[PDB]
Design an enzyme around this catalytic site. Structure first.
Site, mmCIF file in Angstrom:
data_model
loop_
_atom_site.group_PDB
_atom_site.id
_atom_site.type_symbol
_atom_site.label_atom_id
_atom_site.label_comp_id
_atom_site.label_asym_id
_atom_site.label_seq_id
_atom_site.Cartn_x
_atom_site.Cartn_y
_atom_site.Cartn_z
ATOM 1 C CB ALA C 204 -0.960 -0.006 1.171
ATOM 2 C CG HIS C 205 4.422 2.027 -1.712
ATOM 3 N ND1 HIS C 205 4.344 0.983 -0.809
ATOM 4 C CD2 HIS C 205 5.723 2.369 -1.809
ATOM 5 C CE1 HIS C 205 5.555 0.701 -0.382
ATOM 6 N NE2 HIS C 205 6.418 1.543 -0.975
#
Lengths: 372, 374, 374, 374, 374
Positions: C204-205
């Protein structure tokens, strides 16, 4: 200084009638070579006598035995007068063979302007629709009458840059000659009393040579005579009259056979008729301008702009809807019910709109299309 | 009360002239912060020009610009991004296809609704410089207001949001109205001592009408033979750059051809409207010739204003000698035959100012909700 | 000889990873000038990752980036505007929808043909920040090379030029090919003390998977009730600001979730393939899962990779708790029943390098004769 | 003679008003069989409605409607299907997007040419319950008669048959002329003791302007601080499910806010025309304000009447407190300055009745040939 | 765990057969409620039917139906709405253009996402009765799932949401796979005692190929001259109504022409594959013969399966006697020369069951957020 050399090609009545004011202006401002293909007793009347139009610079004498030859010729002959004159640009109107001229033009990289562009009835069974297609799509600048036609054209992906909407030429053409139409003594020379004669024009192929159809028409043309009891002024082709023996006869006393008339005379007739049933191309427009009840005796129209305003009713052939239509047509007009100009018919300066488009867009097409 | 905060971002004179009436109305009914991308600091001499428009001065001069067309674009993005951060306005109002209108790129990243007048503006000749920004600024705007149904059509084909297009009309008819007083009471004719109908006007301001060494020959050669043939002065408003390059070899354009000074809209329109013929490439011409019914000959190879050609308001001269002549001769020959000049459909309307204002008030929120979600 | 002088302009890693194979070719057949918008001063440690990958290093660095997103656009234009004006390339290459590819805006003004790979990328949610650059650069580009028919369609409907579109196909199969020795021979399963098919991975960037308060709660809350349910390690790669905020009230997390040290391309994929389940929001999640057949669950509420759904090579987890549970339960429950993973059409070819090379040669002169006319 | 047998199916009151002019005409020229979907067994009202409006009594009442929407939907199809099969009519006339005009789905089966006025109605919010029935009936009908060129454009783009789209214009400009005296010789201002330009009018009937607990807040709030700001009477018209919901402490909003006794068509318009400002969520708000030139403010976040913004006849308030006070201030601020109120193009013609008559005759037999091959 | 609650709604045997392989996967991966619009009340045949397809029975049986095609439409709407309220399912799965899929009108009013296979079926003959529901249920569905890239294009040009279309491929390959065991071991040739390649099959089920007397004449007349010219027995499966009116003087038609019972999917396909020629209007034929590669002649004037004519896998024999005989010759005369049968592109994939399942878990929510904003 040399003036732009335009070539303008005509073949049929309505070609000549709609171009009528556009040709007279292209004389004023250009060097106009008027070509006429192969194809008439009462076409000499609307040319010269009615339109008081000046002689062509060439008659090509195309025609021939069998359609295939005629179409062949027009292409070939047209090809030569286009070599022999090298005009800067070509004017063409409509859907007749006499604008297969566009094909030859295109081969000789001569820019083509097509008025009565984007004309669609959306029935393949109409003969007109074969050319209509070809020539819309081969003319470099398309000049459709309506925005309906501009839409149709864009939808078949024709260069949206090279479309202009002239409006109908037929307001201007009727205006120019309005005097002569109202002064037409044609009523007085048939002993006819305004709103006490019904005029009919079944000229079209699919309304005579097709069998069940011709039957429907004719039976109704009678019942229309009887149902109102005014003379029916029936204007067809001669064969259509000779063919109407086969022991049908009847045709009341009232159904008369009617000489083919000039522009003024036939309009004056239309204007002051009780009802007009015509498969004429000019009806949808004649009715909208000259303000009269027309039942339009086709199964399809290329003039919807007029349904959008309640100016026309579409008879068809089956007997009932012709009857219903004519009873609707009159009832309506008997209550002084409004009949409005269609949007695209208002402008009466088509002549000059086109002359200015040709001056503007001859180079622009050479530059763009042909890269000179 | 509490009013809508509208930042209106401009940069070039014609930009402003068209917003002229529109800005006035945004001051009336909104909290309009009028940003300029240029400088005011040679502009205490040229303050008259664009107050004389009867317009308040801008609240903010971004003094963008730099070495090259590049630095200068770069700036207009950043310097706008900043002034947009500071004032945090409710909506950005933008005209046309100048470098000023890249402001939209910034407003957009900042989730401010963008309202772009003169949308869908297409001459379809990618070699034309305006057309690069045109494509970009149309597709990054949230509410597109084209002048015309032609231009609505063009936008709907490039696949823009049906719901967020409105046909405002051309702003010009309305502007010209809020100044036909100043125009009709113009000395300009008596200042330059010209009889009405006894001079010919030539406005040639475009790179590719000046620079393309060949086009400049076809034109100068035709500005001559026009003078020669008609035998009237030939008021010629062009750039300084050409005056440099015309003072060599060819003087041939007669005593009759004269230099112009700059002339403010008011004066210049009184000078156009009574000219025998006008050879302009000014984007207006198409609109100005329709409104101030005069003989217009577009010296271009492409128009964004076909609605004129649909009606017969203009002839397109082009850039080849031969037609440039045929074209003027066609103009004069048809005025002298008293042929008709007719109002374009979308130029009829004069309430464009108020038209945008309601639109902005309406579709400000509709865009925050639909396009951003809030 | 003299060869076609071809500027190639990049910014982010993902951008370079894809252009990787395609540059390497350009280097063989052309006079390629590579160029980077960011900084190199520090890079004397990053050098490794973006040389391990066998990729040569940019000829120029533009040390753009500024006080704010806004300065920094304003920079890349003016900066890129110059690198072009100097080196005078025959043509511009370009990939995707980073600010690095406003490079086009300049290239367009300077009449350089732009070729834009990853053309017609659409998810149809303008809340997605990439959707802003995407529209702009596709329309300023001169030749668009979309990965799929899907996008070629998207494009034609935005009324783009029929004749200047080619479907390169995905460049990600060609690149994963060129490194499948460096993938299937990786220690990174040993390194981390992990058996294959015994560990979930989570990437999750994307901000707004992270910054957005609720979306964090749902996502975190899930990575938990996943680890407890499936009772194996849960290797998690997010930014630092999330870890920074994770040491709070919900600190719990559970012992099974770990951090992940950023591992090179080779190593990261070698991870993903042998994983039990993968949750990522990388644009590559769709393609990689396809090419190395593993169960992937996109944490988003739009794709620009429908082709993968057309063949059943991905579920869309979304952002809400209740879903992501099911989507991952699905993911595994399916790869448990031997259900097939199928090559998408536009991912099967692996000549995208030589295609672009052959396409760029062909159309470079065309784009001049046609658009710019020389 | 025989005449064409036209079944005209109706349901809601606004349906019957718009059809009022058009129905009276089909009676004149056809064999019209008028059918109502609801119940007559309350006689009086169903007959005090028709009375003041001078419309005849429906030949038939379908006493459909059931326990739930779902039973009642399906009751219309089956009861409609039956009335069609009995009367064996030539054609079906339908207005709009009420549950009534599922009658088409029946007619279409029984191969009866459907003519469908108010076609191509689109606000592009699927949240809005109309847009369900809108798509369905438009696409099952055989001839679509859209009020405006906008609605044609919409339809052509949903690839409906080119050849069977006619733009009737709005039928309101006609209905409103046909009762022009009944309006101007109307008491409603004496009846309620109001001087013209001295009362605000508010109509909020739409569920979701009302049954949504947040939106209800903002509206009531905004109606409040309007009453106070302008200190005039505020003639409120809303459903009673809302009134009854005024009883719990938020009852305040000043004493100037009155209720409204419903009023027949003539009187409500008289009330609106002479009002200082009008808030309403009627679709008629758009048209009514154009034709009787009074300052309307739509409480929605979508028009299906964008034609009116093309001319600036209207402002869109929304449901937010801020943009509502604002949008009311503009209305009267812009009324104060006598700003113009321009007729929209597709509201001009007033023969919509005779258009529809002439069309139904024309195209009825055409449909039987083309669609149904008889 | 807690799984997605799906309600798949069917009504007809051929509907079910195609869903057969999809439904099975939906019991595996979701909480599937399988509704039926008719009665079971008939253990005798309604149990033997689901025996062969190895399919669990329906959870519910609405028994919708009544007097006329009208009552029965009306009911499927009301009775679907009821059962849709009770179960409050997360999603609705629907197949084709039956009345059963008017289920989507009801489900759409309760903001339940609708998923539609056999999407975008168009033969383009408005006289064909399926072409009414095809139009409605495509345009009221939330996600469309066409078999073909053709039907994508068709759905796209009626302007359906680009993001919400996905090409599953045809479900038939998958269902034949999941049986071709049962088919290749069928006694139906033993039972009816036909040698392979030594009988001709005629499946004439469509009203319009039976009721329209001229069509019925041109076909019967035809079936004889085929029996005669080839001198093989003619397996002929049609309805009761024909048989009853076939025995009207010309009942004699050859000894060779024999009667069919109904036969299962397995048997009838098995009978088909080993036939000399097969004359059908069963939509399946177009597919059944691409897959079980036999000579197919389609007794129809239109096809919803052009993908087959693209590859040369079928001849459309039509209804006129002459063209029928020529068509059947062209079949035999071509299969004797051993000419290529070839796989239709969209008919190759066999993972349609799974494909959908992922696409439902994915767009279940995407639709609740985008279309219903929740």
């Amino acid at each position: 200084m040399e003036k732009l050399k335009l070539m303008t090609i005509v073949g049929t009545r309505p070609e000549i009638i709609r171009l009528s004011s556009t040709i007279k202006a292209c004389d004023q401002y250009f060097n106009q070579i008027l070509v006429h293909t192969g194809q008439d007793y009462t076409l000499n009347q609307i040319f010269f006598d009615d339109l008081e139009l000046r002689q062509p610079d060439h008659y090509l004498e195309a025609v021939g035995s069998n359609l295939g030859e005629t179409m062949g010729n027009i292409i070939a002959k047209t090809y030569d007068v286009l070599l022999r004159e090298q005009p800067d640009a070509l004017l063409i109107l409509g859907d007749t063979n006499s604008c297969l001229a566009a094909v030859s033009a295109k081969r000789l990289k001569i820019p083509v302007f097509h008025m009565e562009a984007g004309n669609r009835c959306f029935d393949q069974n109409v003969p007109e629709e074969i050319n209509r297609k070809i020539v819309d799509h081969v003319s470099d600048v398309n000049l459709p009458y309506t925005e309906h036609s501009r839409r149709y054209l864009l939808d078949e992906g024709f260069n949206k840059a090279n479309i202009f909407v002239t409006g109908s030429p037929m307001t201007e053409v009727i205006e120019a000659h309005r005097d002569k139409i109202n002064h037409s003594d044609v009523l007085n020379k048939l002993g006819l009393e305004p709103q006490q004669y019904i005029l009919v024009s079944a000229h079209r192929e699919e309304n005579i040579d097709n069998e069940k159809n011709f039957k429907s028409l004719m039976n109704a043309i009678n019942d229309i005579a009887k149902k109102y009891k005014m003379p029916v002024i029936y204007s067809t082709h001669p064969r259509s009259w000779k063919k109407i023996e086969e022991s049908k006869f009847e045709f009341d006393p009232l159904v008369k056979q009617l000489k083919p008339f000039g522009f003024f005379d036939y309009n004056a007739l239309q204007k002051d008729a009780f009802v007009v049933l015509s498969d004429s191309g000019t009806l949808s427009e004649e009715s909208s301008i000259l303000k009269f009840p027309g039942v339009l005796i086709r199964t399809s129209t290329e003039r919807p702009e007029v349904l959008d305003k309640g100016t026309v009713i579409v008879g068809g052939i089956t007997y009932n809807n012709l009857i219903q239509s004519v009873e609707l047509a009159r009832e309506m007009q008997n209550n002084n019910e409004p009949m409005i100009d269609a949007i695209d018919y208002k402008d009466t300066n088509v002549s000059t709109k086109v002359v200015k488009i040709i001056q503007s867009y001859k180079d622009i097409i050479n530059r763009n299309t042909w890269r000179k």
